[PDB]
Amino acid sequence: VEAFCATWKLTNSQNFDEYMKALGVGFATRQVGNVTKPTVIISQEGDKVVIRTLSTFKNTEISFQLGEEFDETTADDRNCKSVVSLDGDKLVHIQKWDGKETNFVREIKDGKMVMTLTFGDVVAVRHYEKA
Numbered sequence: 001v002e003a004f005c006a007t008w009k010l011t012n013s014q015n016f017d018e019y020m021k022a023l024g025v026g027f028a029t030r031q032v033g034n035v036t037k038p039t040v041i042i043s044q045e046g047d048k049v050v051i052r053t054l055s056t057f058k059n060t061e062i063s064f065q066l067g068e069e070f071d072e073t074t075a076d077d078r079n080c081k082s083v084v085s086l087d088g089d090k091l092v093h094i095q096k097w098d099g100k101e102t103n104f105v106r107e108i109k110d111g112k113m114v115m116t117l118t119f120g121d122v123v124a125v126r127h128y129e130k131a
């Protein structure tokens with residue numbers, strides 16, 4: 001987890017538009033999700049782990065304890081029951097709403113943070129570089 005503690009900037013993403021289409025996110029929000037390069041701040045603040053995503057179209061922010069379910073209102077406005085946890089060396093984020101489930105895997109790869117987002121059989125990848 002200390003490995004993920006830093007300010008990160010999106011440097012590249014692939015197939016993110018289709019992943020969003022699957023999630024059922026509206027046209028107005030995907031346009032925004034396609035041209036924005038968010039700054040993701042991950043840190044440990046006291047007892048919890050905080051994940052802040054800064055964008056000029058939306059500023060989110062989810063604080064939690066590993067292994068503990070919590071409520072989350074996503075950028076595309078889906079109220080989910082989420083859980084963030086460590087699986088060996090990867091940070092796994094799982095979101096559950098309307099009988100559905102999508103998950104994000106964040107892992108450190110050759111200097112960078114690789115984020116794999118998957119929904120059913122649809123996969124999207126995002127690369128992050130430290131500030």
Ligand SMILES: CC/C=C\C/C=C\C/C=C\C/C=C\C/C=C\C/C=C\CCC(=O)O
Nearest residue numbers: 029033038040053058060072073074075076
């Ligand atoms: C629960 C946190 C949700 C969203 C964070 C806020 C803004 C993200 C940017 C644009 C909104 C577009 C789509 C919302 C759906 C999924 C967002 C997935 C990952 C966040 C991107 C990242 O890690 O920088």
